Design a protein around this ligand. Structure first.
Ligand code: CDL
Ligand code: CDL
Ligand code: 3PE
Ligand code: 3PE
Ligand code: 3PE
Ligand code: 3PE
Ligand code: 3PE
Ligand code: LMT
Ligand code: LMT
Ligand code: LMT
Ligand code: I49
Lengths: 83, 347, 48, 174, 95, 99, 96, 112, 140, 171
């Protein structure tokens, strides 16, 4: 640790541009895994509807699929509106 | 070259070849050839002299041209079938273009001229890669597209390579040019049987590589690139002359040696298909190779050529070259005929 | 136009299948003024 | 007529190829390839390939051909030969144009031609897709997929470019 | 592939781009999706020797969708007849 | 259409200004190797190779719309990191010095 | 086939003939090689775009990247040849 | 199977014996490689590095044994394929009616 | 080649001698042009006219060899009244071999060519009668 | 090949919804809520039948519902709706976010006079289910019978009879 602190101070004095590059590149690699908001990135991308949502042929055994878009069943974007 | 860079470049040569062999997509096949060519050029140039630069340039121009013809065939194939799967091609012009593209990469006659030129101009170890490992990727592609190859084109290419390779070797005193022409003829055997039994293509390829690696390894152990230099071997390492004699007799197809096996099995497959004239003609033409293989055995092992006084100084030092795998390769190059039924592992 | 052409069948498919096939541009506008064909073919690509 | 833009561009494409392929001075040979590159982009743009067309300008013309001309000035030619002064260049250049003119004349006349193979002459617009009303560029979606579907493409492509740097540095060290 | 490492390991290195009826971004279909799908399903598992004979109907339709050679011919043919009558004055286009 | 007219106008005007710039009254009645460093070739080639990989990074704004963000982010960083390794190799092998 | 394929295919053949019929400068042959790549790029893009094969939209970019990298290597050999002889004339490459 | 050296169905076949004459010949080849190793490096051919000579024989036999398994398996598969095809296609392999030599006519060619 | 070769074999032996002689001379001339093309491309002629002379030498020599073979072989079949006889081509093959000896101004080449072309021609006739295959289609 | 069967010009006539895209844009959210059923029936037919000729009667019901939808705006909410879609129409991208004040007026109108509630963010992108008496198509691709597979090779693996049988070898 004490040897590592001396090494970091030496490159801060001599190569501050390179030290900044490596620190920033390290944060790019590491922070996405530690961030509590990285999971919303997938949810938001999933929620964007790029093509028509083709309806399903109701067979009487689909209690979880809504009959109307304003019915309560089906995925909700309430988390997104609050977020 | 730094030894780590040399290792990484060699692994890139192997990786590109492996990409060709595992790919199901024509684009990745083409990438594998592109990757492979990029990594081999520096080992051709590594001695930095005008002859290596000329060889590298000639190799680049040949291989780049074949890569463009290959991609043209692939795109024609896409137009007429709408897919990229590595398999039979769906257009006869695509098949001809790919066959000629792959013939150029292999250095088959009449696209052969670069093989003796390039092999002479590069070191022995680089020539070992060029004439063995570099055959795998194009052969593995021919192994998969053969159902759609034109028979007359493939057999015409095969017959010319056997003729040119045989006549080309008769006039050679350079060992690298002897290997280059020997290689051209052997490719003709490999592709001649391909329309009939690809397994016998693989058998011929593997044995050719084993025998070719043995010769290059033995040339390297002594730093011999010419016939006359090789004729000093008896007065330095007598065992090497015996080993070179046995391998040369095997590369000539003489029974009971290993190199008889691929030609024996190819003759069988062709005759099962009522092909008598062609295998007969190929076998007789292969006697041209036996002549200039025997000539090397005369000047290397079966006679004793004049020596020089400074040779005495060499007696005091041992061989320090690695000669990696040589004892195994020479035994496999010469003593495998009793195990011929083992070819079924290639099925 | 093809009433008297010998051996012509009107509206004959070029496909063995009887499945509906989406018509290409020539099938729809093959008999129409070049201007509408310009708009239909290159209008979007040429719109700023 | 503008309906034949792609055919007309393809004619200029070919004439530019007869230009640099006849091999004038590589200064002028480079110019002909540059014009063909631009014309080649024009063809691609009229098939909905906006991104692909622009990469030709950016990478082919702006990148590779810039380096070609750069190297030409350093190691090939600084003073160009007068264009078509050589008889071989003039003969091939005129020979190539002559074939292209005849290919064009008969296609326009008959609305088809058989130059070794049979080609149609109604107009390239005929084969175009008639339905389109997605809210996105399909080409862009396909290219963006290089990072989701094409992991293996990215690995081998990136490795090859790194090896290119390593290899070229070895090659030129001497 | 020469060595089918991809199937052995269950890894998809490059099968995803081989055909046009494979999964596409945002489920964007190719023009000939139905024709490629029909031909592939016909020829599956029987081998190319049998396929070249027994799936010939599906493959010709697929090639017609890919290159539209019969369709372009039929249009090119109807157009000649039209121009003939217009020139000979026995036909008049509708408004 | 509008784009072709804009391009034609720009270069047509540039042509006219140039030829006019060359013709005005006056009122007068009476193939080798450049001695140029290998270093400048390597700059051009290095620009080319770096430019080719920037071509592969250009689609990233679209790729970030993907639901497969784990893979996209890994591949994007993998590419940029290999781009940095290329620079570090040039750098440590003295490919960036001018002396 | 469509009109365009005639001329694009003709363009590829012209550059291939140019490639196979050398003159003197090695750079001229390298230009014919890159001309072939260009026509392959256009023909690939047209086929992929017209069929609306979405995932292959990337293929032409991959082709351009690898061919440019191959071109960089070819240029490196050209300069190394020119450093040896002072010209890029291919008739100097006859030691072998 | 797919890209498998020894698929699972191969385990139904008898293994090669460790006294197989083909495996013995492979071991002899391994022994010959050991002697050639000594000869090229100018060691005493018979005595030098018996530890190295032993690994030559062992490596050949170990690899040879597995190659002989796949060899015998591939011929078993060929035979299995051949007999299945003959059973599936009895019309192409009719049980021909066989005549005795008293019934069949053969021309006589005197040797005089 | 397929078109010309099929024309030669379609004509029966010993009938329409001139039609046979056209097929062989056309085949021979094409072979001579092929040789000239490679010779000019690989061994560069000193001048343009020298290249034209070389093409004429090879092309006429090959055509002359083919012409005499077709003439000699078909007359012999007609004169002998032996259509399906390999010996007619043996006579024709040797006659063509002699012309090569004449064109190259050598008796040795003429003697060798007679033997080597004569046997080759006779074997081609046996192959036609017996149905021997040179490029056999894969059967098994 | 047969004849491509086509409906007559009289089968293809229906009252059209001849309003500009900014008008459709302005009413789209309420249109999605009100005309969902005939709209989702028609889209089910199209992805099931894969044939425009097979869904023309559902297609006409799509128009009839849209015309009745727009007549209800005309009877009670014409002036607030015109102010709104004119605001949409001004924008070159037809942006909702630049018109919230006019949207609110049009929304307070339909809610009061017609009872219409604007669907929430995410609602109109839901997959729904429709009860259709139209039978499920059997062979929408018009597929031919598939070729019969090659006979399956089966049984017990036995050693090769007398080994490899390669020439003289006994194993
Ligand atoms: C059925 C068909 C016909 C039969 C097919 C049989 C195919 C052949 C089988 C493979 C034969 C390879 C040679 C076997 C090794 C014999 C040499 C030896 O004893 O090395 C001992 C080796 C050192 O011996 P050495 O004195 O330095 O030189 C030995 C040879 O001259 C060094 O000779 P080398 O320079 O050529 O190097 C040999 C070896 C590299 O040298 C080694 O390190 C030995 C590695 C041999 C691995 C044997 C495993 C075989 C089982 C496969 C599973 O190469 C490898 O890496 C093998 C892969 O000791 C070890 O380190 C044991 C290996 C530990 C792992
Ligand atoms: C060790 C202990 C293991 C044990 O107890 O069994 C070993 C075995 C007894 O096993 P077994 O179960 O009682 O069966 C013995 C039957 O008599 C033999 O039973 P088999 O009738 O089934 O024969 C074995 C079978 C298996 O095929 C083989 O590979 C047999 C071994 C090949 C020996 C040929 C090279 C000599 O042979 C064949 O199918 C055909 C014969 C192969 C002839 C190949 C000739 C073509 C190449 C031309 C070479 C010219 C010489 O005793 C041996 O004789 C060893 C096998 C011989 C090779 C290993 C020794 C090296 C000798 C090479 C001499 C080099 C030539 C000098 C000049
Ligand atoms: C079965 C065939 C086995 C093939 C084994 C080949 C063993 C390699 C040859 C041993 C000779 C000793 C040696 O040093 O290797 C040669 C070469 C090293 O090159 P070298 O000049 O010695 O030094 C390089 C440093 N700049 O190393 C090389 O360049 C590698 C050359 C061999 C690569 C091709 C091997 C053949 C194909 C293998 C697949 C078999 C199927
Ligand atoms: C089993 C099934 C397969 C059967 C096929 C046959 C395989 C045989 C080939 C095996 C593989 C090659 C290995 C050959 C072993 C050679 C051993 C040998 O010849 O003796 C070595 C001897 C050593 O010489 P030196 O270094 O000086 O040490 C001793 C002091 N004088 O060297 C010398 O003294 C040099 C003497 C001059 C050379 C004389 C030349 C005649 C000797 C030829 C014998 C080798 C024949 C090989 C050809 C194939 C045989 C069929
Ligand atoms: C059941 C047993 C079967 C035995 C017969 C089988 C023969 C077939 C297998 C042959 C395969 C090749 C053999 C490898 C050769 C190794 C011997 C050698 O090359 O040198 C001869 C050697 C000389 O011994 P040394 O004084 O130590 O000098 C060493 C010089 N480096 O000689 C010696 O002094 C060591 C004693 C053994 C030498 C063997 C000689 C090999 C002769 C084979 C010639 C080829 C076959 C004809
Ligand atoms: C020198 C002697 C070469 C043979 C003389 C040329 C000849 O007559 O054969 C040309 C050959 C004709 O064969 P073809 O009509 O195409 O039918 C396929 C037959 N299996 O045409 C070919 O397809 C093969 C061309 C052979 C080229 C020379 C080897
Ligand atoms: C594959 C499909 C194409 C089939 C034809 C393939 C032929 C390829 C021949 C390429 C290798 C030929 C190399 C060669 O023979 O050298 C060139 C040769 C020059 O020899 P030339 O001058 O004609 O003879 C008189 C010399 N005093 O010039 C020649 O005459 C070669 C003629 C070969 C004709 C066969
Ligand atoms: C030369 C080799 C260079 C290789 C460089 C590789 C660098 C890769 C660094 C980032 C890789 C992982 O990056 C990120 O990790 C976090 C871990 O919480 C993942 O996790 C995040 O997204 C997932 C999606 O499945 C959510 O379910 C999860 O709740 C969320 O935390 C991200 O999906 C991923 O994008
Ligand atoms: C050395 C220069 C190389 C230049 C390469 C330039 C690329 C040229 C690409 C041409 C592709 C055309 O490919 C060719 O097209 C026609 C069009 O139907 C195909 O079709 C033709 O032959 C088949 C035979 O069954 C039938 O469809 C039909 O008789 C005929 O139309 C050919 O089978 C195909 O070989
Ligand atoms: C030069 C060094 C070479 C080192 C090679 C290292 C291994 C490279 C492996 C890359 C492929 C990994 O494995 C493959 O990748 C991605 C996830 O990453 C997955 O593919 C993913 O992207 C698209 C998006 O739909 C689909 O293909 C698939 O639905 C999805 O899972 C594949 O289902 C997986 O099989
Ligand atoms: N004869 C061909 N051309 N091809 C081919 N290998 N066909 C397969 C016949 C075969 C032969 C040996 C074995 I062992 C097996 Cl399992 C199968």
């Amino acid at each position: 640790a004490e040897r590592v602190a001396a090494f970091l101070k030496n490159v801060w004095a001599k190569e501050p541009v390179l030290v900044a590059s490596f620190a920033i590149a390290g944060l790019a690699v590491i922070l996405p895994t530690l961030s509590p908001y990285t999971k919303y990135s997938l949810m938001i991308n999933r929620a964007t509807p790029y093509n028509y949502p083709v309806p399903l042929r109701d067979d009487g055994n689909m209690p979880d699929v809504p009959s109307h878009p304003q019915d309560p069943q089906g995925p909700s974007l309430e988390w997104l509106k609050r977020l | 070259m730094n030894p780590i860079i040399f290792i990484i470049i060699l692994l890139t040569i192997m990786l590109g070849t492996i990409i060709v062999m595992i790919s199901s997509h024509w684009l990745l096949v083409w990438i594998g050839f592109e990757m492979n060519m990029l990594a081999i050029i520096p080992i051709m140039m590594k001695n930095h002299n005008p002859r290596a630069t000329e060889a590298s340039t000639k190799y680049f121009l040949t291989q780049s041209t074949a890569s463009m013809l290959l991609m043209m065939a692939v795109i024609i194939n896409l137009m007429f079938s709408g897919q990229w799967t590595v398999m039979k091609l769906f257009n006869p012009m695509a098949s001809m273009l790919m066959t000629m593209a792959l013939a150029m990469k292999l250095g088959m006659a009449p696209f052969h001229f670069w093989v003796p030129e390039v092999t002479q101009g590069i070191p022995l170890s680089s020539g070992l890669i060029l004439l063995t490992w570099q055959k795998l990727a194009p052969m593995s592609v021919l192994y998969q597209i053969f159902p759609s190859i034109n028979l007359n084109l493939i057999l015409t290419l095969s017959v010319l390579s056997i003729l040119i390779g045989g006549w080309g070797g008769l006039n050679q005193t350079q060992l690298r040019k002897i290997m280059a022409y020997s290689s051209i003829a052997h490719m003709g055997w490999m592709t001649a049987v391909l329309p009939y039994n690809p397994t016998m293509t693989l058998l011929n390829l593997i044995i050719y590589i084993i025998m070719t690696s043995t010769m290059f390894t033995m040339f390297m152990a002594n730093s011999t690139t010419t016939t006359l230099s090789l004729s000093h071997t008896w007065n330095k390492t007598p065992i090497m002359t015996v080993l070179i004699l046995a391998t040369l007799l095997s590369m000539g197809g003489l029974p009971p040696l290993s190199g008889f096996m691929p030609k024996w099995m190819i003759i069988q497959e062709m005759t099962k298909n009522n092909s008598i004239i062609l295998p007969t003609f190929m076998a007789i033409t292969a006697l041209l190779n036996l002549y200039f293989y025997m000539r090397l055995t005369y000047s290397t092992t079966l006679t004793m050529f004049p020596s020089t006084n400074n040779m005495k100084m060499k007696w005091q030092f041992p061989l320090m070259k690695k000669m990696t795998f040589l004892p195994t390769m020479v035994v496999l190059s010469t003593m495998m005929l009793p195990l011929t039924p083992m070819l079924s592992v290639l099925e | 136009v093809m009433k008297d052409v010998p051996g012509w069948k009107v509206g004959e498919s070029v496909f063995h299948t009887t499945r509906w096939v989406t018509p290409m541009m020539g099938e729809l506008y093959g008999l129409r003024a070049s201007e509408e064909v310009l708009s239909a073919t290159y209008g979007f690509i040429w719109y700023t | 007529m503008m309906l034949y833009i792609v055919f007309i561009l393809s004619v200029i494409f070919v004439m530019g190829f007869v230009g640099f392929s006849s091999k004038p001075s590589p200064i002028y040979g480079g110019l002909g390839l540059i014009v063909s590159g631009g014309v080649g982009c024009g063809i691609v743009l009229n098939f909905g390939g906006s991104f692909l067309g622009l990469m030709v300008f950016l990478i082919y013309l702006g990148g590779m051909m810039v380096v070609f001309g750069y190297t030409t000035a350093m190691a090939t030619e600084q003073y160009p030969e007068i264009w078509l002064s050589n008889k071989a260049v003039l003969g091939a250049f005129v020979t190539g144009l002559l074939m292209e003119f005849f290919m064009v004349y008969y296609v326009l006349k008959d609305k088809e031609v058989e130059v070794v193979f049979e080609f149609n002459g109604l107009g390239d617009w005929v084969i175009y897709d008639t339905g389109d009303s997605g809210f996105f560029s399909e080409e862009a979606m396909g290219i963006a997929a290089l990072y989701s579907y094409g992991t293996w493409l990215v690995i081998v492509t990136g490795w090859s470019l790194l090896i290119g740097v390593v290899v070229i540095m070895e090659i030129t060290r001497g | 592939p020469f060595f089918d490492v991809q199937k052995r390991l269950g890894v998809d290195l490059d099968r995803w781009m081989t055909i046009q009826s494979a999964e596409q971004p945002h489920k964007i279909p190719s023009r000939c999706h139905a024709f490629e799908k029909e031909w592939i399903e016909c020829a599956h598992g029987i081998g190319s020797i049998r396929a070249e004979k027994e799936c010939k109907i599906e493959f010709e339709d697929f090639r017609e969708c890919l290159l539209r050679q019969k369709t372009m011919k039929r249009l090119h043919a109807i157009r000649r007849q039209r121009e003939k009558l217009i020139k000979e004055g026995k036909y008049t286009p509708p408004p | 259409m509008n784009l072709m007219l804009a391009l034609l106008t720009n270069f047509t005007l540039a042509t006219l200004l140039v030829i006019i710039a060359f013709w005005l009254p006056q009122l007068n009645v009476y193939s080798a190797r450049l001695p140029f460093s290998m270093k400048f070739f390597l700059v051009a080639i290095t620009f080319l190779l770096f430019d080719l990989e920037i071509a592969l990074l250009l689609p990233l704004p679209w790729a970030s719309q993907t639901a497969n963000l784990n893979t996209m982010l890994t591949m994007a960083l993998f590419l940029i990191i290999l781009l940095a390794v290329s620079l570090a190799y040039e750098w440590t092998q003295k490919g960036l010095e001018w002396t | 086939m469509s009109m365009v394929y005639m001329n694009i295919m003709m363009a590829f053949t012209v550059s291939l003939v140019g490639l196979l019929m050398y003159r003197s400068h090695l750079m001229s042959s390298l230009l014919c090689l890159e001309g072939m790549m260009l026509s392959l790029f256009v023909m690939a893009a047209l086929t992929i775009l017209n069929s609306h094969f979405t995932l292959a939209s990337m293929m032409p970019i991959i082709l351009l990247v690898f061919a440019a990298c191959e071109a960089a290597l070819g240029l490196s050999l050209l300069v190394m040849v020119s450093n040896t002889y002072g010209t890029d004339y291919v008739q100097n490459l006859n030691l072998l | 199977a797919t890209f498998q050296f020894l698929p699972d169905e191969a385990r139904s076949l008898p293994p090669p014996k460790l006294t197989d004459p083909r495996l013995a010949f492979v071991g002899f080849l391994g022994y010959c490689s050991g002697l050639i190793d000594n000869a090229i490096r100018r060691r005493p051919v018979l005595l030098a590095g018996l530890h190295r000579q032993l690994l030559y024989i062992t490596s050949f036999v170990f690899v040879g044994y597995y190659l002989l398994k796949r060899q015998d398996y591939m011929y078993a598969v060929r035979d299995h394929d051949m007999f299945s095809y003959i059973k599936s296609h009895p019309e192409d392999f009719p049980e021909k009616d066989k005549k005795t030599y008293g019934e069949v006519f053969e021309e006589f060619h005197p040797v005089r | 080649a397929k078109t010309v070769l099929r024309q030669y074999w379609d004509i029966p032996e010993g009938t329409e001698c001139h039609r046979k002689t056209y097929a062989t001379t056309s085949i021979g001339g094409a072979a001579g042009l092929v040789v000239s093309a490679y010779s000019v491309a690989l061994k560069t002629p000193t001048s343009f006219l020298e290249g034209v002379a070389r093409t004429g030498r090879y092309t006429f020599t090959a055509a002359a060899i083919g012409a005499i073979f077709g003439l000699t072989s078909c007359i012999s079949a007609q004169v002998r009244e032996k259509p399906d006889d390999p010996l007619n081509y043996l006579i024709g093959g040797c006659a063509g071999g002699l012309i090569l000896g004449a064109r190259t101004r050598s008796y040795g080449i003429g003697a060798a060519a007679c033997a080597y072309m004569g046997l080759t021609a006779a074997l081609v006739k046996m192959g036609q009668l017996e149905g021997w295959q040179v490029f056999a289609e894969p059967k098994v | 090949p047969g004849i491509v069967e086509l409906p007559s010009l009289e089968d293809l006539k229906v009252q059209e919804v001849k309003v500009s895209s900014s008008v459709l844009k302005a009413a789209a959210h309420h249109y999605g809520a009100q005309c969902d059923k005939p709209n989702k029936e028609f889209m089910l037919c199209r992805w099931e039948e894969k044939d425009p000729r097979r869904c023309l009667e559902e297609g006409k019901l799509v128009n009839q519902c849209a015309l009745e939808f727009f007549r209800q705006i005309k009877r009670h909410c014409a002036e607030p709706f015109t102010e709104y879609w004119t605001c949409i129409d001004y924008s070159g991208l037809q942006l909702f976010r630049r018109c919230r004040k006019q949207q609110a007026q049009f929304d307070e109108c339909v809610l009061d006079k017609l009872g219409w509630v604007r669907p929430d963010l995410g609602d109109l992108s839901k997959v729904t289910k429709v009860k259709t008496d139209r039978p499920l198509p059997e062979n929408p691709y018009h597929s031919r019978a598939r070729p019969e597979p090659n006979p399956e090779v089966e049984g017990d693996l036995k050693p090769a009879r007398h080994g490899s049988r390669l020439f003289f070898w006994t194993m």
